């Protein structure tokens, strides 16, 4: 529930990936301030060089930390499962390319929040804009629509990454997502509303391994009622 967000909580993140066969690992750690909505990680290729785009690994690389505000925090899945935990799941499709398919679970250890996952890409182009790296290192701002999904106790989700191409294209990420709570206990299940986020990506200028630092920002928004502000 809210109480284990209530100051800054750290973050570990594993990320084991196979894309087209080609097999690696990425680490991060940071740290979470969910009052406010703010995450601040570092993540390192462990196993050499990154055969995919760093934007395209942003949305797999833990929305528990969104600002709900208080009119809407009872629609608050991700934080009512915790700290027990949720698993995951997504299929990202890149139009007229390869495919992404996620599995995570996120839950506390001790006083860590900690994001888990597997990665499987296939029927990527060798020289796509994915395995041929022509995605530009920034991330334009999302939102992340949530709707409740009672068969399974928990949430599913939509939204179209739009990534930035060298040549002033776009390529989109169409998302797909699930998300189970972890064992037996009681969730809030939502209405459906929206998460926004904005994310800005950089380097470590000390940091000669592959990596990518992020900051990010995610507010959650689609509900009005009870929000008395708003009256008047
Ligand atoms: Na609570
Ligand atoms: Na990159
Ligand atoms: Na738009
Ligand atoms: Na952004």
């Not at 139009?95 to 900690?114: I, N, P």
């Not at 990506?201 to 940091?207: F, G, Q, V, Y």
Request: proline share 4%.
């Amino acid at each position: 529930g809210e109480e284990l967000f209530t100051g800054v909580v750290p973050i570990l993140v594993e990320l084991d990936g196979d894309v087209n066969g080609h097999k690696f690992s990425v680490r991060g750690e940071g740290e979470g301030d969910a009052t406010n909505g703010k995450l601040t990680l570092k993540f390192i290729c462990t196993t050499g060089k990154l055969p995919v785009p760093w934007p395209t690994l942003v949305t797999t690389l833990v929305q528990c930390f969104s600002r709900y505000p208080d009119h809407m925090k009872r629609h608050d899945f991700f934080k009512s499962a915790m700290p027990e935990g949720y698993v995951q799941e997504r299929t990202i499709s890149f139009k007229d390319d390869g495919t992404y398919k996620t599995r995570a679970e996120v839950k506390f250890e001790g006083d860590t929040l900690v994001n888990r996952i597997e990665l499987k890409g296939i029927d990527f182009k060798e020289d796509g804009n994915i395995l041929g790296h022509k995605l530009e290192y920034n991330f334009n701002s999302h939102n992340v629509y949530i709707t409740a999904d009672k068969q399974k106790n928990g949430i599913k989700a939509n939204f179209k990454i739009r990534h930035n191409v060298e040549d002033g294209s776009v390529q989109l990420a169409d998302h797909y997502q699930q998300n189970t709570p972890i064992g037996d206990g009681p969730v809030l299940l939502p209405d459906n509303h929206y998460l926004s986020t904005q994310s800005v990506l950089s380097k470590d200028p000390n940091e000669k391994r592959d990596h990518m630092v992020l900051l990010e920002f995610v507010t959650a928004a689609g509900i009005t009622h009870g929000m008395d502000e708003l009256y008047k």
